[PDB]
């Protein structure tokens, strides 16, 4: 049981869509080939910066609107972004 | 430079709401993606630890507590 699958990439193999979960666990897959104590930091970086950086564009920097959408506050998006040096 | 695809893994997410974005209120984008990502993520460890917990707690550099939490958050418990 999944939450959603409105999230899908496009791979061209021609262009086919499939769910973005696929590709995590790709990546994962991919990084396990080759003693980790953090992964879910390391994932949560890979996915917060791109998640932050299309809704900032998207809402044209307002950082209220960008936190509605996030369905966070204003205070918890501005921590975020330090936190990656977006801010 | 650690998580990548056949590269790196952010792309995807970029290109993944890029294409969700096309679909639009909104405002749960935050979990929905942690979602997609966490549930995945979980699957993936616990299947490399063989669903041993404390293992897969201590790659994720979490506490065993938080990792339950989650599994249970996702109805993997």
Redesign the interface.
């Known amino acids: 049981?999944?939450?959603?699958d409105?999230?899908?990439?496009?791979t061209v193999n021609q262009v086919t869509?499939k769910?973005?979960?696929?590709?995590?666990?790709?990546?994962?897959?991919?990084?396990?080939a080759q003693?980790?104590?953090?992964?879910?930091?390391?994932?949560l970086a890979?996915?917060e910066?791109?998640?932050l950086?299309?809704?900032m564009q998207?809402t044209r920097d307002n950082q209220t609107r960008a936190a509605?959408?996030?369905?966070?506050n204003r205070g918890t998006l501005r921590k975020k972004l330090k936190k990656y040096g977006m801010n």
């Not at 769910?19 to 396990?32: C, E, I, M």
């Not at 003693?35 to 994932?43: A, G, K, P, R, S």
């Open positions: 049981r999944v939450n959603s409105v999230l899908t990439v496009s869509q769910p973005l979960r696929d590709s995590v666990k790709q990546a994962l897959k991919n990084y396990f003693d980790v104590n953090d992964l879910y930091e390391l994932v890979e996915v910066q791109p998640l950086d299309m809704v998207y509605l959408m996030m369905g966070i």
